[PDB]
Amino acid sequence: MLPGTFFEVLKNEGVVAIATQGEDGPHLVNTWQSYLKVLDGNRIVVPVGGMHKTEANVARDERVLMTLGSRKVAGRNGPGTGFLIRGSAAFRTDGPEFEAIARFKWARAALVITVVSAEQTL
Amino acid sequence: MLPGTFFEVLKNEGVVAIATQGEDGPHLVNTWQSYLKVLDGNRIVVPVGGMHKTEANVARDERVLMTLGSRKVAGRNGPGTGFLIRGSAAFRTDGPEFEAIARFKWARAALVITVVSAEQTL
Ligand SMILES: Cc1cc2nc3c(=O)[nH]c(=O)nc-3n(C[C@H](O)[C@H](O)[C@H](O)COP(=O)(O)O)c2cc1C
Ligand SMILES: Cc1cc2nc3c(=O)[nH]c(=O)nc-3n(C[C@H](O)[C@H](O)[C@H](O)COP(=O)(O)O)c2cc1C
Ligand SMILES: [Cl-]
């Protein structure tokens, strides 16, 4: 379901934001869009170093939001675009999904987001 | 509240992410770094075109989270840094906080975030 424009965004560096439901409000953490590994079956894989609070939140409510964008990819009405992604999250520590981010020596886990929707919001 | 490194990040373009508490989970929207207008007294102003869901969320829970970063500013252990900002949000349609972003003619309002903490997370 992830569109070509999203893959264009990934050719450019930028900050990714990942929102989870915490016990007293949202939580918000980051990765780099160059770190993202996209696998078939609508999966976005993020290398996890910290994200201990994020992981605890995901254990309670698997639903996450992710945003990312680039000034270098045209939106609907000018230069620059980005996406709101909604999906379900899981944390893997062995197997192919963990192996996907094993280029990152500092990683303790792989955050696997299975995308339910992707909305180009600009 | 806001450190020099945060202002260094603002010399560069990038996507800002703003999380609010929604009725059934977090909400997450964006602006551009170049749009942020920082005022005296720890205020970050964002031009608002849409943000209707975000505004409804803020009306019920004023606490928001904001992240942003840049690969072009040194973090603690290598190139690239960013911030988690926590603050209270209000929407203005007039007065000096609105006038701060009124140059954006598509702006129906100003989102004013009064910063309570700023954490460099990389
Ligand atoms: C630009 C940027 C990129 C980051 N990349 C990662 C990352 O790839 N993996 C990670 O675990 N934390 C990364 N961090 C730190 C996380 O945003 C977060 O602060 C940390 O993992 C703690 O997560 P938690 O608050 O859920 O415990 C990055 C921070 C910034 C500002
Ligand atoms: C990179 C990027 C920058 C954006 N800049 C703004 C902005 O400055 N102001 C704004 O109201 N919406 C901006 N948008 C759209 C918002 O993220 C959001 O989708 C829209 O305001 C609707 O908000 P809501 O879901 O709270 O109703 C931007 C989107 C992207 C991807
Ligand atoms: Cl960008």
CSV table of C-alpha atoms and ligand atoms in Angstrom, one decimal:
chain,number,residue,atom,x,y,z
A,1,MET,CA,0.0,0.0,0.0
A,2,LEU,CA,3.0,2.4,0.6
A,3,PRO,CA,3.2,4.6,-2.5
A,4,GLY,CA,6.0,5.5,-4.8
A,5,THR,CA,6.2,9.0,-3.4
A,6,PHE,CA,6.9,7.5,0.1
A,7,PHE,CA,9.9,5.6,-1.4
A,8,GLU,CA,11.1,8.9,-3.0
A,9,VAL,CA,11.0,10.5,0.4
A,10,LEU,CA,13.2,7.6,1.7
A,11,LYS,CA,16.0,8.5,-0.8
A,12,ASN,CA,16.5,11.7,1.2
A,13,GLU,CA,17.6,12.1,4.8
A,14,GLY,CA,15.3,13.4,7.5
A,15,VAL,CA,13.9,12.7,10.9
A,16,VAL,CA,11.1,10.1,11.4
A,17,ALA,CA,8.7,10.5,14.3
A,18,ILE,CA,6.9,7.6,15.9
A,19,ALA,CA,4.0,8.2,18.3
A,20,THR,CA,2.7,5.7,20.9
A,21,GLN,CA,0.0,5.8,23.6
A,22,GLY,CA,1.6,6.3,27.0
A,23,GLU,CA,-0.1,6.0,30.4
A,24,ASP,CA,-0.5,9.8,30.8
A,25,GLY,CA,-0.5,11.1,27.2
A,26,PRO,CA,1.3,10.3,24.0
A,27,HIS,CA,4.9,9.5,23.7
A,28,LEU,CA,7.1,10.5,20.7
A,29,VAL,CA,10.5,9.2,19.6
A,30,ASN,CA,12.6,9.4,16.4
A,31,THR,CA,14.7,7.5,13.9
A,32,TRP,CA,16.4,8.6,10.6
A,33,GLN,CA,14.6,7.9,7.4
A,34,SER,CA,17.8,6.5,5.9
A,35,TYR,CA,17.7,3.7,8.6
A,36,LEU,CA,14.2,2.5,7.5
A,37,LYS,CA,14.1,-1.0,5.9
A,38,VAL,CA,10.9,-1.7,4.0
A,39,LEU,CA,9.9,-5.3,3.5
A,40,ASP,CA,7.0,-6.9,1.6
A,41,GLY,CA,3.7,-7.3,3.4
A,42,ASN,CA,3.6,-3.5,4.2
A,43,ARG,CA,6.4,-3.7,6.9
A,44,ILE,CA,8.6,-0.8,8.0
A,45,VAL,CA,11.6,-1.9,10.1
A,46,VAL,CA,13.4,0.5,12.5
A,47,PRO,CA,16.6,-0.2,14.4
A,48,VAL,CA,16.0,0.0,18.2
A,49,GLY,CA,18.8,1.1,20.6
A,50,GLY,CA,16.7,2.9,23.2
A,51,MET,CA,12.9,3.0,22.8
A,52,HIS,CA,12.3,1.3,26.2
A,53,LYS,CA,9.4,3.6,27.0
A,54,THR,CA,8.1,3.2,23.4
A,55,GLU,CA,8.3,-0.6,23.7
A,56,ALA,CA,6.4,-0.6,27.0
A,57,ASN,CA,3.7,1.5,25.4
A,58,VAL,CA,3.5,-0.8,22.3
A,59,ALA,CA,3.0,-3.8,24.7
A,60,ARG,CA,-0.1,-2.1,26.1
A,61,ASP,CA,-1.4,-0.7,22.7
A,62,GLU,CA,0.2,-1.9,19.5
A,63,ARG,CA,-1.2,1.0,17.4
A,64,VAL,CA,1.4,3.6,16.4
A,65,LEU,CA,1.6,6.7,14.2
A,66,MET,CA,4.6,7.6,12.1
A,67,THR,CA,5.4,10.8,10.1
A,68,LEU,CA,8.2,11.6,7.8
A,69,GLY,CA,8.8,13.9,4.8
A,70,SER,CA,11.2,15.7,2.6
A,71,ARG,CA,11.6,19.2,1.2
A,72,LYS,CA,13.1,17.5,-1.9
A,73,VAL,CA,10.1,15.6,-3.0
A,74,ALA,CA,7.1,17.5,-4.6
A,75,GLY,CA,3.8,17.5,-2.8
A,76,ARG,CA,0.4,18.2,-4.3
A,77,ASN,CA,0.8,22.0,-4.2
A,78,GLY,CA,4.5,22.8,-4.2
A,79,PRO,CA,8.0,21.5,-3.3
A,80,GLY,CA,8.0,19.3,-0.1
A,81,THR,CA,5.8,16.5,1.1
A,82,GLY,CA,5.2,14.0,3.8
A,83,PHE,CA,3.2,11.1,5.2
A,84,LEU,CA,1.1,10.1,8.1
A,85,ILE,CA,1.4,6.3,8.5
A,86,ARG,CA,-0.8,4.3,10.8
A,87,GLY,CA,0.1,0.7,11.7
A,88,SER,CA,0.6,-1.9,14.4
A,89,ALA,CA,4.0,-2.4,16.0
A,90,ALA,CA,6.0,-5.3,17.3
A,91,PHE,CA,9.6,-5.6,18.7
A,92,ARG,CA,11.7,-8.5,17.3
A,93,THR,CA,14.9,-9.8,18.8
A,94,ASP,CA,15.6,-12.7,16.5
A,95,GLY,CA,14.7,-14.0,13.0
A,96,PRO,CA,14.5,-12.3,9.6
A,97,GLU,CA,13.0,-9.1,10.8
A,98,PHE,CA,15.7,-8.6,13.4
A,99,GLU,CA,18.3,-9.6,10.8
A,100,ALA,CA,17.0,-6.8,8.6
A,101,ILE,CA,18.6,-4.2,10.8
A,102,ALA,CA,21.7,-6.1,11.8
A,103,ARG,CA,23.9,-3.6,10.0
A,104,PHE,CA,23.3,-1.5,13.2
A,105,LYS,CA,25.8,-2.8,15.8
A,106,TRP,CA,24.1,-0.8,18.6
A,107,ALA,CA,20.7,-2.4,18.0
A,108,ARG,CA,19.0,-4.4,20.7
A,109,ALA,CA,15.8,-5.0,18.7
A,110,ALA,CA,13.9,-4.3,15.5
A,111,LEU,CA,10.7,-2.3,15.6
A,112,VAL,CA,8.4,-3.7,12.9
A,113,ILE,CA,5.5,-1.5,11.9
A,114,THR,CA,2.9,-3.2,9.8
A,115,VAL,CA,1.2,-0.4,7.8
A,116,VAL,CA,-2.6,-0.2,7.8
A,117,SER,CA,-2.7,3.2,6.0
A,118,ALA,CA,-0.4,5.8,4.5
A,119,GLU,CA,-1.7,9.3,3.9
A,120,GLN,CA,0.2,11.9,1.9
A,121,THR,CA,-0.7,15.0,4.0
A,122,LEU,CA,1.0,17.6,1.8
B,1,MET,CA,14.5,26.5,28.1
B,2,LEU,CA,15.7,26.1,24.5
B,3,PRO,CA,19.4,25.6,24.0
B,4,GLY,CA,21.7,26.9,21.3
B,5,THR,CA,21.9,23.5,19.6
B,6,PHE,CA,18.1,23.7,19.0
B,7,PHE,CA,18.6,27.0,17.3
B,8,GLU,CA,21.4,25.4,15.2
B,9,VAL,CA,18.9,22.8,14.1
B,10,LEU,CA,16.5,25.6,13.0
B,11,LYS,CA,19.2,26.9,10.5
B,12,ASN,CA,18.3,23.8,8.5
B,13,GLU,CA,15.1,22.7,6.9
B,14,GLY,CA,13.3,19.6,8.1
B,15,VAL,CA,10.0,18.1,9.1
B,16,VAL,CA,8.7,18.9,12.6
B,17,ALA,CA,6.3,16.4,14.3
B,18,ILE,CA,3.7,17.4,16.9
B,19,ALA,CA,1.9,14.8,19.0
B,20,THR,CA,-1.4,15.4,20.9
B,21,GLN,CA,-3.7,13.2,22.9
B,22,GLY,CA,-6.7,12.1,20.8
B,23,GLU,CA,-9.9,10.4,21.9
B,24,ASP,CA,-8.7,6.9,20.9
B,25,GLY,CA,-4.9,7.2,20.9
B,26,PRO,CA,-2.3,9.8,19.9
B,27,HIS,CA,-2.5,12.1,17.0
B,28,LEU,CA,0.5,13.3,15.0
B,29,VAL,CA,0.9,16.2,12.6
B,30,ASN,CA,3.7,18.2,11.0
B,31,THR,CA,5.1,21.5,10.1
B,32,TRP,CA,8.4,22.7,8.6
B,33,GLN,CA,11.4,23.7,10.7
B,34,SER,CA,11.7,26.9,8.7
B,35,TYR,CA,8.1,27.9,9.7
B,36,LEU,CA,8.8,27.8,13.5
B,37,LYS,CA,8.8,31.3,15.0
B,38,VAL,CA,10.5,31.3,18.5
B,39,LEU,CA,9.5,34.1,20.9
B,40,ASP,CA,10.7,35.4,24.2
B,41,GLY,CA,9.4,33.4,27.2
B,42,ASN,CA,10.0,29.9,25.8
B,43,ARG,CA,7.3,30.1,23.1
B,44,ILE,CA,7.4,28.2,19.7
B,45,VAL,CA,4.8,29.4,17.2
B,46,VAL,CA,3.5,27.3,14.3
B,47,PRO,CA,1.3,28.6,11.4
B,48,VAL,CA,-1.9,26.6,11.4
B,49,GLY,CA,-3.7,25.9,8.1
B,50,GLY,CA,-5.4,22.6,9.0
B,51,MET,CA,-4.8,21.1,12.4
B,52,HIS,CA,-8.5,20.7,13.2
B,53,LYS,CA,-8.1,17.4,14.9
B,54,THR,CA,-5.0,18.6,16.7
B,55,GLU,CA,-6.9,21.7,17.8
B,56,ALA,CA,-9.8,19.6,19.2
B,57,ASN,CA,-7.2,17.5,21.1
B,58,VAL,CA,-5.5,20.6,22.5
B,59,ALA,CA,-8.8,21.9,23.7
B,60,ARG,CA,-9.2,18.8,25.9
B,61,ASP,CA,-5.5,18.2,26.9
B,62,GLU,CA,-3.1,21.1,26.3
B,63,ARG,CA,0.0,19.0,26.7
B,64,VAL,CA,1.9,18.4,23.5
B,65,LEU,CA,5.1,16.8,22.3
B,66,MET,CA,7.3,18.1,19.5
B,67,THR,CA,10.4,16.5,17.8
B,68,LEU,CA,12.8,17.8,15.2
B,69,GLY,CA,16.4,17.3,14.2
B,70,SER,CA,19.1,17.7,11.6
B,71,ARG,CA,21.9,15.5,10.3
B,72,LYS,CA,23.8,18.8,9.8
B,73,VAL,CA,24.2,19.6,13.5
B,74,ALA,CA,26.5,17.5,15.7
B,75,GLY,CA,25.0,15.3,18.4
B,76,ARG,CA,26.8,13.9,21.4
B,77,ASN,CA,28.4,10.9,19.7
B,78,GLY,CA,28.5,11.8,16.0
B,79,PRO,CA,26.8,13.9,13.2
B,80,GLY,CA,23.1,14.5,13.6
B,81,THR,CA,21.0,15.5,16.5
B,82,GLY,CA,17.4,16.3,17.6
B,83,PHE,CA,15.1,17.2,20.4
B,84,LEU,CA,12.1,16.1,22.3
B,85,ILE,CA,10.2,19.2,23.4
B,86,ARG,CA,7.3,19.1,25.9
B,87,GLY,CA,5.0,22.1,26.3
B,88,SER,CA,1.5,23.4,26.7
B,89,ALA,CA,-0.4,24.5,23.6
B,90,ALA,CA,-2.9,27.2,22.8
B,91,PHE,CA,-4.4,28.4,19.5
B,92,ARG,CA,-4.7,32.1,18.7
B,93,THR,CA,-6.5,33.9,15.8
B,94,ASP,CA,-5.4,37.4,16.8
B,95,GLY,CA,-2.9,39.3,19.0
B,96,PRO,CA,0.9,39.4,18.8
B,97,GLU,CA,1.4,35.6,18.8
B,98,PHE,CA,-0.9,35.3,15.7
B,99,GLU,CA,0.8,38.3,14.1
B,100,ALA,CA,4.2,36.5,14.5
B,101,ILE,CA,3.1,34.0,11.8
B,102,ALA,CA,0.5,36.1,9.9
B,103,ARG,CA,2.9,36.4,6.9
B,104,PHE,CA,1.7,32.9,6.1
B,105,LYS,CA,-1.6,33.9,4.4
B,106,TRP,CA,-3.0,30.4,4.5
B,107,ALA,CA,-2.8,30.4,8.3
B,108,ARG,CA,-6.2,30.5,10.0
B,109,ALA,CA,-4.5,30.5,13.4
B,110,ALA,CA,-1.2,30.2,15.3
B,111,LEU,CA,-0.3,27.2,17.5
B,112,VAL,CA,1.6,28.6,20.4
B,113,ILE,CA,3.6,26.0,22.4
B,114,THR,CA,5.0,27.2,25.7
B,115,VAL,CA,8.0,25.0,26.3
B,116,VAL,CA,8.3,23.2,29.7
B,117,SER,CA,11.3,21.0,28.7
B,118,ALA,CA,13.7,20.5,25.8
B,119,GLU,CA,15.8,17.3,25.8
B,120,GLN,CA,18.5,16.6,23.2
B,121,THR,CA,17.9,13.0,22.5
B,122,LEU,CA,20.9,12.3,20.2
C,1,LIG,C1,17.1,12.3,14.8
C,1,LIG,C2,17.1,11.2,15.8
C,1,LIG,C3,17.2,9.8,15.5
C,1,LIG,C4,17.2,8.8,16.4
C,1,LIG,N1,17.3,7.5,16.0
C,1,LIG,C5,17.1,6.5,16.9
C,1,LIG,C6,17.1,5.2,16.4
C,1,LIG,O1,17.3,4.9,15.2
C,1,LIG,N2,16.8,4.2,17.3
C,1,LIG,C7,16.6,4.4,18.7
C,1,LIG,O2,16.4,3.5,19.5
C,1,LIG,N3,16.6,5.7,19.1
C,1,LIG,C8,16.8,6.8,18.2
C,1,LIG,N4,16.8,8.1,18.7
C,1,LIG,C9,16.4,8.3,20.1
C,1,LIG,C10,14.9,8.1,20.3
C,1,LIG,O3,14.2,9.2,19.6
C,1,LIG,C11,14.5,8.1,21.8
C,1,LIG,O4,14.9,9.3,22.4
C,1,LIG,C12,15.2,6.9,22.6
C,1,LIG,O5,15.3,5.7,21.8
C,1,LIG,C13,14.5,6.7,23.9
C,1,LIG,O6,13.2,6.1,23.6
C,1,LIG,P1,12.1,6.0,24.7
C,1,LIG,O7,11.8,7.6,25.2
C,1,LIG,O8,10.9,5.4,24.1
C,1,LIG,O9,12.7,5.2,26.0
C,1,LIG,C14,16.9,9.1,17.8
C,1,LIG,C15,16.8,10.5,18.1
C,1,LIG,C16,16.8,11.5,17.2
C,1,LIG,C17,16.6,12.9,17.6
C,2,LIG,C1,6.1,18.3,6.0
C,2,LIG,C2,4.7,18.8,6.3
C,2,LIG,C3,4.5,20.1,6.7
C,2,LIG,C4,3.2,20.5,7.1
C,2,LIG,N1,3.1,21.8,7.5
C,2,LIG,C5,1.9,22.2,8.0
C,2,LIG,C6,1.8,23.5,8.6
C,2,LIG,O1,2.7,24.3,8.7
C,2,LIG,N2,0.5,23.9,9.2
C,2,LIG,C7,-0.6,23.0,9.1
C,2,LIG,O2,-1.7,23.4,9.5
C,2,LIG,N3,-0.5,21.8,8.5
C,2,LIG,C8,0.8,21.4,7.9
C,2,LIG,N4,0.9,20.1,7.4
C,2,LIG,C9,-0.3,19.2,7.4
C,2,LIG,C10,-0.5,18.7,8.9
C,2,LIG,O3,0.5,17.8,9.2
C,2,LIG,C11,-1.9,18.0,9.1
C,2,LIG,O4,-2.0,16.9,8.2
C,2,LIG,C12,-3.1,18.9,8.8
C,2,LIG,O5,-2.8,20.2,9.4
C,2,LIG,C13,-4.4,18.4,9.4
C,2,LIG,O6,-4.2,18.4,10.8
C,2,LIG,P1,-5.2,17.5,11.7
C,2,LIG,O7,-5.0,16.0,11.4
C,2,LIG,O8,-4.9,17.8,13.1
C,2,LIG,O9,-6.7,17.9,11.4
C,2,LIG,C14,2.1,19.7,7.0
C,2,LIG,C15,2.3,18.3,6.6
C,2,LIG,C16,3.6,17.9,6.2
C,2,LIG,C17,3.8,16.5,5.8
C,3,CL,CL,13.4,17.9,4.7
